[PDB]
Amino acid sequence: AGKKVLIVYAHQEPKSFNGSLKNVAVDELSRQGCTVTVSDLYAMNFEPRATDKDITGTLSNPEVFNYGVETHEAYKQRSLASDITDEQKKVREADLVIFQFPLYWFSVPAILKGWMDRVLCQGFAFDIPGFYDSGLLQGKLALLSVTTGGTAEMYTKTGVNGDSRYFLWPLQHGTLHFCGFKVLAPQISFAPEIASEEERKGMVAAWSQRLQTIWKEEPIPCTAHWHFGQ
Amino acid sequence: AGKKVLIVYAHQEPKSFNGSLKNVAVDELSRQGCTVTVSDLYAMNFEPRATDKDITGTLSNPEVFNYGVETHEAYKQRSLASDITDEQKKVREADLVIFQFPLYWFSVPAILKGWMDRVLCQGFAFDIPGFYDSGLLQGKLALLSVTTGGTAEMYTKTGVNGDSRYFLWPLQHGTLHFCGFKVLAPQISFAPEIASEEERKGMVAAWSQRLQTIWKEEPIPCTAHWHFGQ
Numbered sequence: 342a343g344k345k346v347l348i349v350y351a352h353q354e355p356k357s358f359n360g361s362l363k364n365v366a367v368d369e370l371s372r373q374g375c376t377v378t379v380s381d382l383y384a385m386n387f388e389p390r391a392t393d394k395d396i397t398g399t400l401s402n403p404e405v406f407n408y409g410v411e412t413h414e415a416y417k418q419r420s421l422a423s424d425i426t427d428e429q430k431k432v433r434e435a436d437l438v439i440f441q442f443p444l445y446w447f448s449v450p451a452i453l454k455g456w457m458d459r460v461l462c463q464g465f466a467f468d469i470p471g472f473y474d475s476g477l478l479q480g481k482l483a484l485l486s487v488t489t490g491g492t493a494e495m496y497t498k499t500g501v502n503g504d505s506r507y508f509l510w511p512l513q514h515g516t517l518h519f520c521g522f523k524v525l526a527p528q529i530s531f532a533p534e535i536a537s538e539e540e541r542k543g544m545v546a547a548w549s550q551r552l553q554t555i556w557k558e559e560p561i562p563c564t565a566h567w568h569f570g571q
Numbered sequence: 572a573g574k575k576v577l578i579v580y581a582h583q584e585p586k587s588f589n590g591s592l593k594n595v596a597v598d599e600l601s602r603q604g605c606t607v608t609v610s611d612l613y614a615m616n617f618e619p620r621a622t623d624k625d626i627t628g629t630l631s632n633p634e635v636f637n638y639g640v641e642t643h644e645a646y647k648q649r650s651l652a653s654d655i656t657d658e659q660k661k662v663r664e665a666d667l668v669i670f671q672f673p674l675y676w677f678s679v680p681a682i683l684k685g686w687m688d689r690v691l692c693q694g695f696a697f698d699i700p701g702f703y704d705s706g707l708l709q710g711k712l713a714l715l716s717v718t719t720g721g722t723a724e725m726y727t728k729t730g731v732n733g734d735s736r737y738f739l740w741p742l743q744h745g746t747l748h749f750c751g752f753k754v755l756a757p758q759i760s761f762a763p764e765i766a767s768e769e770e771r772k773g774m775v776a777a778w779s780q781r782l783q784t785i786w787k788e789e790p791i792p793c794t795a796h797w798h799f800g801q
């Protein structure tokens with residue numbers, strides 16, 4: 342009574358396991374009466390590159406191009422490309438941002454990396470002052486829902502990939518905490534592709550299940566100690 | 572000596588501090604007699620999105636598109652888009668791959684993330700099985716030359732950002748080591764925007780200076796302990 346949720350989704354295939362997970366999040370959150378909006382990056386052909394096209398009108402310095410400066414000023418002067426400001430409006434309205442993506446190289450797919458690079462701009466998402474605990478997005482929740490190719494076992498302290506929390510750091514702390522998000526525990530669906538079709542059926546159901554009480558949840562302590570420590 | 576180097580460069584502005592580090596690498600390795608190639612990703616308008624456009628033949632499963640499966644097959648059949656195979660030929664021929672980039676959200680800019688997602692495909696850079704010390708690019712070296720907005724002090728274990736090595740993990744270990752590269756110690760040029768003009772000139776010459784004896788360096792132990800301590 343009531344909540345707004347943005348799902349930033351990065352998978353090429355609607356019939357994929359990621360697509361199922363995005364669709365059960367939409368179904369469950371809509372059923373609870375939440376306002377839901379989805380940014381389907383691939384379907385939108387979302388631009389991942391940080392270029393001077395991201396500024397309309399004229400550059401606060403067309404001699405030397407500096408992306409961060411130009412986008413900081415463009416933001417303040419309402420001169421950012423509309424793909425960007427369409428996304429920032431969705432984020433500004435959201436109480437929760439859920440990112441749904443397969444892990445690509447211990448991180449997000451480039452198209453979703455480009456969303457963070459280009460949407461979470463200085464003045465919108467952070468400022469002096471206003472990072473970490475005081476980043477401009479404080480008040481909001483963010484949650485990573487990741488699928489992997491490697492098994493839970495590979496993702497331990499002394500498994501081949503190291504601990505899941507190791508790759509989460511740049512996303513949870515370096516990006517989401519930096520901006521002021523309180524970060525909920527990641528949802529990780531380990532290795533769907535090596536089934537079973539029913540164990541999959543089941544990982545979907547657990548995600549839906551968890552979305553039922555998502556609003557009761559406590560944020561993780563987003564710390565060096567949480568990700569690396571013991 | 573008789574060595575081939577590929578620099579993968581990701582900055583929009585030739586007069587930038589990244590541009591200067593890239594040029595000094597080129598000047599110094601060329602002076603040594605090395606064969607040098609640069610992939611200047613922004614200038615190439617390098618495509619970062621992993622889509623079905625990257626395969627030109629009949630898809631192995633056209634009903635449900637799986638980028639990893641379809642590119643693995645495409646690589647074996649030689650039906651990958653030519654921008655990808657152009658980069659693969661550069662990598663295949665290189666003895667050392669240097670990545671030169673500003674840190675973006677604790678990671679590489681999206682356009683370079685897209686290079687890693689699309690160029691390092693299954694069959695070319697790794698196979699399952701055939702990764703980490705068995706990865707397919709064994710015998711090659713890689714090095715990250717990264718510039719930051721944050722100062723060295725901010726990137727320490729007790730600094731706001733955590734230790735600099737924490738954000739290297741997904742790139743050094745999860746991508747480069749996974750593919751079989753031996754990783755040389757990163758070159759991190761801290762906060763050049765803050766540094767004085769002579770400190771900048773000094774950071775440029777420290778890189779040029781290091782490159783004088785690069786072929787004598789040993790790789791780092793690319794393990795959790797090196798990155799996280801403990």
Ligand SMILES: Cc1cc2nc3c(=O)[nH]c(=O)nc-3n(C[C@@H](O)[C@@H](O)[C@H](O)COP(=O)(O)OP(=O)(O)OC[C@@H]3O[C@H](n4cnc5c(N)ncnc54)[C@H](O)[C@@H]3O)c2cc1C
Pocket residue numbers: 391407408409457458459515582586587588589590591672673674675676677678717718719720721722763764768771772775
């Ligand atoms: C989307 C985004 C995300 C970011 N995320 C992060 C992050 O997670 N962590 C973080 O720490 N930072 C982050 N930053 C900021 C940071 O990485 C960059 O600002 C960058 O590393 C600075 O490098 P540059 O080449 O652009 O510097 P420039 O601004 O080009 O360098 C300062 C310059 O010295 C220059 N110069 C060029 N050549 C020379 C030379 N030969 N001698 C002396 N001076 C020279 C220019 O004259 C200019 O004054 C982010 C920035 C953006 C836009």
Ligand SMILES: Cc1cc2nc3c(=O)[nH]c(=O)nc-3n(C[C@H](O)[C@H](O)[C@H](O)COP(=O)(O)OP(=O)(O)OC[C@H]3O[C@@H](n4cnc5c(N)ncnc54)[C@H](O)[C@@H]3O)c2cc1C
Pocket residue numbers: 352356357358359360361362442443444445446447448488489490491492533534535538541542545621635637638639687688689745
């Ligand atoms: C460039 C790249 C880099 C990568 N890097 C990494 C990495 O660093 N680490 C790592 O661990 N992995 C990595 N991977 C592997 C990748 O993370 C996994 O392939 C991906 O997460 C699988 O998720 P998906 O949605 O694509 O699964 P899918 O293959 O689409 O689905 C698994 C199965 O579930 C089925 N399905 C669809 N809907 C449902 C439903 N409702 N219920 C049950 N089943 C359903 C599908 O049809 C399929 O049979 C990488 C892959 C690529 C292409």
Ligand SMILES: COc1ccc(OC)c2c1c(C)cc(=O)n2C
Pocket residue numbers: 446447490491492495502639699745749
């Ligand atoms: C390209 O990277 C991968 C592609 C496919 C994978 O499994 C299908 C990968 C991985 C990685 C990095 C780790 C990893 O554990 N797995 C399991």
Ligand SMILES: COc1ccc(OC)c2c1c(C)cc(=O)n2C
Pocket residue numbers: 409515519676677719720721722725732
């Ligand atoms: C978008 O992230 C940044 C943009 C600009 C920055 O400084 C110029 C940043 C940062 C971060 C994350 C850390 C950080 O320490 N700095 C210093």
Ligand SMILES: [Zn+2]
Pocket residue numbers: 513514515518519562563564565
């Ligand atoms: Zn944090």
Ligand SMILES: [Zn+2]
Pocket residue numbers: 743744745748792793794795
């Ligand atoms: Zn390693």
